[PDB]
Amino acid sequence: YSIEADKKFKYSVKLSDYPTLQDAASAAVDGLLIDRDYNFYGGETVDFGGKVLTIECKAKFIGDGNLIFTKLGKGSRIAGVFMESTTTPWVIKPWTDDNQWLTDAAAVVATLKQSKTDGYQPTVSDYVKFPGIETLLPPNAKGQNITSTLEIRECIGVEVHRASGLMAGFLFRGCHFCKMVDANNPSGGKDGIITFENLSGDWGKGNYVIGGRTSYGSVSSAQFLRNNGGFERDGGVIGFTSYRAGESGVKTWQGTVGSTTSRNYNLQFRDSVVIYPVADGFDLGADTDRPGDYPITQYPLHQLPLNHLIDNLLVRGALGVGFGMDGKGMYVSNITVEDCAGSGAYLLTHESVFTNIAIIDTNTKDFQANQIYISGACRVNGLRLIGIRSLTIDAPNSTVSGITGMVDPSRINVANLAEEGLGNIRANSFGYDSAAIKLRIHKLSKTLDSGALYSHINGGAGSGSAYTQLTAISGSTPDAVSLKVNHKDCRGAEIPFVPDIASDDFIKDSSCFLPYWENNSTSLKALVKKPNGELVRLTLATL
Amino acid sequence: YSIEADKKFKYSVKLSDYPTLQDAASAAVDGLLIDRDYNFYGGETVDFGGKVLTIECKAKFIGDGNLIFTKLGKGSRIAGVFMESTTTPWVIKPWTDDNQWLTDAAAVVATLKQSKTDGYQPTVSDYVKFPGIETLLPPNAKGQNITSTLEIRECIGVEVHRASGLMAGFLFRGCHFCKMVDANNPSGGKDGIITFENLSGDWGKGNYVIGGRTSYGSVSSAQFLRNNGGFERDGGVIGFTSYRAGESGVKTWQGTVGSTTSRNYNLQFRDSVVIYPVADGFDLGADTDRPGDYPITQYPLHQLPLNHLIDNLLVRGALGVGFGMDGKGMYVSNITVEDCAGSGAYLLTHESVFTNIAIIDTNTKDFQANQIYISGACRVNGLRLIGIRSLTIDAPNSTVSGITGMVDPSRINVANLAEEGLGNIRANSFGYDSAAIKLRIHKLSKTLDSGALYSHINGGAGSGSAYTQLTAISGSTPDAVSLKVNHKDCRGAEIPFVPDIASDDFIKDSSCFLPYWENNSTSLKALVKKPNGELVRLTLATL
Amino acid sequence: YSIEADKKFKYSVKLSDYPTLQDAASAAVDGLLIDRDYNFYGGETVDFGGKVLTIECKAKFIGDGNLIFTKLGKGSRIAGVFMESTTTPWVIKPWTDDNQWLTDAAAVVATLKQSKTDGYQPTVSDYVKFPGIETLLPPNAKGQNITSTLEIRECIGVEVHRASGLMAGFLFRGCHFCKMVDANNPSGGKDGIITFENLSGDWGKGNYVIGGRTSYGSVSSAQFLRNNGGFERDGGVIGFTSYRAGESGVKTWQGTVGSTTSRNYNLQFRDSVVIYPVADGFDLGADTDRPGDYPITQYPLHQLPLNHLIDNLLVRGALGVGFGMDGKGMYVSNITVEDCAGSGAYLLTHESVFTNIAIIDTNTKDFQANQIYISGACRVNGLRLIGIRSLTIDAPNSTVSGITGMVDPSRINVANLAEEGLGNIRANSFGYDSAAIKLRIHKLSKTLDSGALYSHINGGAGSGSAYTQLTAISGSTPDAVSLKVNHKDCRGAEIPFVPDIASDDFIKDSSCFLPYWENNSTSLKALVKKPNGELVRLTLATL
What's the longest Cα–Cα distance across chain A? Predict the structure, then answer.
């Protein structure tokens, strides 16, 4: 029988048969079932002998600190892992029962409670976020560092599916071709919930976060350090949801970490949602003299050729910036940012193109100077601004086209704004006695329209009559001077004349005449510039 | 050997070794394989003893009625379950071989056949949908109620993957943190194909429909009752496809069901597609005096703070409404609705913002009064209307900006329409001898333009000459009065004058003159309003 | 014990216990583990006896040619299969270290190396792509045909999950309801990486590519032949990523293949990305007299009722066309195409509607005549053109609305262009001393504006003064003739007069007068068309 049984049954060892996880790991052949809770000590390391194992979790890994899995064969998969700390730390919950953000330090300190979820352990960044909280926080709620972390170390081709936990953390250190798939809403701890760190060895490649969601955590939900997906863009965050990150939803590190670069290149950030981050929705910047990376002489600050593939992202409820990034020659598209306390978009980009961006009701708490900021020479094609609620857009060097929304024109600052390819046009006016087409030269004034083409009703609704008027501003009074056609259904043109003797320099073109008033004789004269260019004054109208 | 075998093999019991499913359930430890068809009786209940089991299905569960699974441990998963009724009921197929909807009751009754798919069992809602069908339907095709339903009862953390079936139904009753993942196109029965019902106990939370598709069914494909995902938006429908729902593709219930509220809050409806529903694509309304919910005094009808996260939805071929909803303070974005028989969007929303909405060829069968309806004070930023095919939009209290499409201006009714932030403009005219910029004051007339700025060719193409004309409507005749510049390349301005003695009240502003005709002397006079405001009549032109 | 063990353990056979795969297949009951590398010979066929098996791969299938799996029961799934050729062929890598495409044949031939990845085996299509490469390529780099292919033959309900490999290929021949799920980035060989071929038997249905990615390959990544998903749109490519396809990312075949039609109907192509294809991103055409398909008399060339559900696609870096297709009555939406060497969109469609299309920086290498081409009578609603970089759009028979971007108006050719539903308008000018609203009649000239309404600053910034001017082109000189209001803050209207005796035909409407010059008397006369229609010449201004 044994011979037969050995060839007809599925191999699998279970943790309940062993005293330690390593013993179970040493016995494992094909499968390994975690069928009983296992308390680990920080630093507990498990060597899997390069075996391609299928680890199925039906119990928890309990402990503060890291549980290190090493030497897993390419193709190994862990499903259902639940990480839980042994400590229940002090957490703050900076939002009300109506889901209103609390920005007052005393108000936030008042939210203190011991819990493994529904809030996060304060960090130094909070000292900056809620001014004066550092002096208000009790010593026991400061400097905490609780996180039950599963650390996968220097492995290739390992995938973690449907992971979960309380005060949980997932760290891939020195890994390649690993994926965090369908994270089953783990509640974060002190460190990043999902981190791909490659500060040593080769730049991380093939590392992804695919689907799923996370909640809470003191810092960022998903984060990468020194990863480069290459031209193939092998790596990134796709179809992921982050909720209430103590810092940002998705973050690519900036500057020098340790003695090398923590920057990232050629990654994908697509089809993802980030809601209510205490900081930013997406922090995709690289710079904050670049050991391990491009020198400043080659690429100036904020001008690295990051080349991330960025598309179809949604951000809502950020206490900070909805979408932030830097870099040169970037192509960004289909970004929707709604209801943010600080800037919806803070762009330190140069020679980049943004297509179909929607920034709806951001900088609601005046944290920044604008709803959207772009520093370098960029191109924006399609920009929807204003929802139902300081400049709106400040992109001094960018060329914009296609803005939609109830924007205040005096709150727009760009290098150039133009609609070169519209067809025949119709201005449809609703709720008013007139329709209008206004012209505003921002060099003359950002607050006053310089001219206009109106159409006003003559009489009342259904009169079948209106008068058209062409105007010009004078003395900073918009519409001061104007020509009308059909005022009071009279069917004639009302023409404005110089109230006094017209000076020679008033007339501009030849073969034109400019009517002017001669009060001393109750006459209307006409300064005429003959087709030959000569000036002559003629009597136009008299008694 | 036994000792060894016990520790080296994967545990799993199979249904072929047991007489009843409960016996197999009682023996199960880790896995459970359904390797033979099992005929169940309606109400057959299986108790899983709180075990975290992995149920793998390779056969069918055959029976009309419900197969109840209870006490499954958190973390249990069922994969490949196939539900099939024993009865082959009478189904109608209200669409032609060219995929044309049949709206004639006699035509639909003619489609009757006995089948477990490719149509659905008629319900009372069909009596309303196809007028007079109630009296045409034969008694045996009426009041049917066939559905082979897998009911998961009061469980937490249970997931059903790749489920399928014929006349199938999946009901999660009193469940939390359960998911319907990658539904492998089950063909629906009488009840909802996927239902998350929490009328008892706590409001459902953590319940999702992730990916997959369903086909047919008498009512809605995916539906929720009394679920609240909280601020974290823990729950919803993401990446799902519904085809030919007898009622709606995705539905959140409204009003009182039983003695409590069936309404839903804080759910996600994203990245989904609904094609050919007999009713609506997405029915996300809450109201149709609210036991178990907010009182009408707190929140008026259709003004509940639903707070669903709604983004990136597509609807095509609905016989009803493509996208419907109500609520207050909602943010909706990236919705595309094409080819619908009734309203593309029916919005009973107040103080809500809609961003980037595309309603293409809807209300093709004049079922409603408009293509898109919005009742309350809302904001629309980006609205694409008209494809290749009664008002188009009726949003009496909403402010709109950025409409694109070959819309008929007289079919637009809104509170305000404006393009405040456009840059320098160019009207490009193709296929015509002129380009135009028209002004229409809807208060004066919704069908006639009140004024215009044109450019017309002088001579023919390539003449290098055109004349500009500013016009005004009079006597309900558009362009009745006008001023021209360069008519017939003459290089002069043609000016309109009052055909008779101009009345004092005709002139509007000081320092202006209005030419008028004096027929009795073949003279052109001029009513002049001096810079001081006084009126004087002067002789302008004479023989 | 045996009795007990037989009922409590999970069944599974492993390849290491058998000499051939068929032996293992014959012994398999529930599971089958590929735990050792298996070298197969081309054509090696495995019969699975109609068993519903779960094949788990932890090793490779090594061989050039096809490994044929037949008679797998409905519900079978293969996970982790790794295909690898035994031959390391010669591959070209037509892109530089800066990810620049090489278009020079000598430059591309210089990239030759023997490798199983990072390039592809040249095919005849390359002879066309890189002109003269055919004569430059060494005989050993020509006519290669290396591909380690897993062929699933005539099966139903079989799914392949997380497949991978080197010079790998996956062929579903005569299959239905099969899916290629989460392809784990296999590197392609000579043939298509994922092919659903149904040239025999019924049209393929229920066949999908769901998620995942592929890299390289000589031809197309995902491709279908003679598949029809029906009205239910049961089949397609959803959430897939293709990188560097030797031909196209996603392709539906055209014309007659063998003796029948290779065309496809009713499929879905949604939520997918195609980057750097040597040819096209998406080739969704059907035509290139249609055996097995609709006759040309019924549907003319390029006018088949394809009915694919196409939405949310992204294409970047194509050396060819970003998005191509043909067909009649199609609805296409949310397509974003960036940085392509040839046309971003080549549309041989008729009576179709395109909604929200963004073509950003395409035809960068002038491979085509335009960035976007549409042949038939189509409708485009929302078109974003030009990024940061020959006509831009050539759609002679289409009606367009809502173009955004810094487009050159002379590079637009359409049947009609109009913005019928805009509200009140404001032209905001930045960086200039004037704002403008220009009119261009393309029939008169595609390069010169025929008229304009300007607003120019009087003096300098902050003067609070500007002058409005209405102009008209004459002698092919734009703005030749104009009327001004407030030039030099004079507050009067400067009016242009005919430089000579105005001819009778110059005046257009009755009750109007046209000033003209009478040089022989230094007088200004006026040609007047009385309200009765009669002409009279009056003296207007004199000395």
Answer: 131
Amino acid present at A542: T
**Residue in C10, C418, C499 nearest the CB of B491:** C499
Instruction: Write down the catalytic residue from A159, A283, A311, A479.
Output: A283
According to DSSP, residue C203 is labeled P
User: Of A151, A197, A247, A293, which residue is the catalytic one?
Assistant: A247
Question: Under a CB-based contact definition with an 8 Å cutoff, are residues C127 and C137 in contact?
Answer: no
For every residue of C185-202, DSSP letters joined together read: EEEE-SS-SEEEE-SSSS
Token pair, residue C402, equals 């809502």
Distance in angstroms (rounded) separating the CA atoms of residues A63 and A79: 19
Q: Which helix (H) or strand (E) holds A239?
A: none
* Cβ-proximal residues to A85 (8 Å cutoff; 6+ apart), any chain: A62, A63, A64, A116, A146, A147, A148, A166, A167, A168, A189
- Stated as kind and residue range, the H or E segment containing A461 is none
Question: 3-state class of C173 per DSSP?
Answer: strand
How far, rounded to the nearest angstrom, does the alpha carbon of residue B357 sit from its chain's CA centroid? 10
- Non-local (6+) Cβ contacts of B534 within 8 A are none
Encoding tokens for residue B48? 């899983």
- Close Cβ partners of B40 (under 8 Å, ≥ 6 residues apart): B21, B61, B62, B63, B65, B67
Q: Which residue of A has its CA nearest to C244?
A: A232
Instruction: Return the bridge partners of B219, or none.
Output: none
User: Could you tell me if A43 and A68 are in contact, meaning their C-beta atoms sit under 8 angstroms apart?
Assistant: yes
Contact between C466 and C442 under an 8 Å Cβ cutoff? The reply is no
C247 is catalytic: yes
Say if CB A390 and CB A369 are below 8 A apart: yes
Distance of CA A384 to the CA centre of its chain: 14
Residues 6+ apart with CB under 8 A from A488: A458, A467, B505, B506, B508
| Residue A351 annotated in active site | no
Candidate list C191, C280, C287, C394, residue with the active-site label: C280
User: Is beta strand C512-518 parallel, antiparallel or unpaired with respect to B250-252?
Assistant: unpaired
**Backbone interruptions in chain C following residues (C to N > 2.5 Å):** 288, 389
**Method used to obtain the model:** X-ray
Yes or no: say if A537 and A529 are a contact pair by the CB < 8 Å rule: no
Question: Which residues of B carry out catalysis?
Answer: 247, 280, 283
Query: In terms of C-beta distances under 8 Å and separation of at least 24 residues, what long-range contacts does B98-104 make, across chains too?
Result: B99/B276, B99/C231, B101/B319, B101/B341, B101/B365, B103/B130, B103/B319, B103/B341, B103/B365, B104/B130
* Residue tagged 């293969």 (tokens): C78
Contact C280, C288 (CB under 8 A): no
Q: Is A285 helix (H, G, I), strand (E, B) or coil?
A: coil
Look at strands B451-457 and B466-474 and give their pairing: antiparallel
B488/C505 touch (CB, cutoff 8 Å), yes or no: yes
* Whole-angstrom distance, CA of residue A418 vs CA of residue B287: 45
A373, two tokens: 């900021």
Beta bridge partners of B100: none
Task: Note whether C430 contacts B408, CB cutoff 8 Å.
Answer: no
> Position of tokens 């060895």?
A201
Question: What's the one-letter identity of residue C495?
Answer: I
Tokens of C222: 């995902």
Residue found under tokens 């929304």 = A405
Sequence ranges of the domains in chain B = 1-543
**Which of C131, C178, C140, C186 lies closest to C162, judged by CA?**
C186
Dihedral sign of CA atoms A296, A298, A301, A304 in order: negative
Token representation of residue A99: 């889901």
Query: How wide is the angle at C-alpha A71 spanned by C-alphas A65 and A72, nearest 5°?
Result: 95
Cβ proximity of A148 and A177 under 8 Å? no
d(CA B377, CA B381) in angstroms, rounded, equals 14
Q: Contact C330/C291 with Cβ under 8 angstroms?
A: no
Other C-beta atoms within 10 Å of B433: how many? 15
Residue labelled with tokens 């055909």: B499
What CATH number was assigned to the domain covering residues A1-543? 2.160.20.20
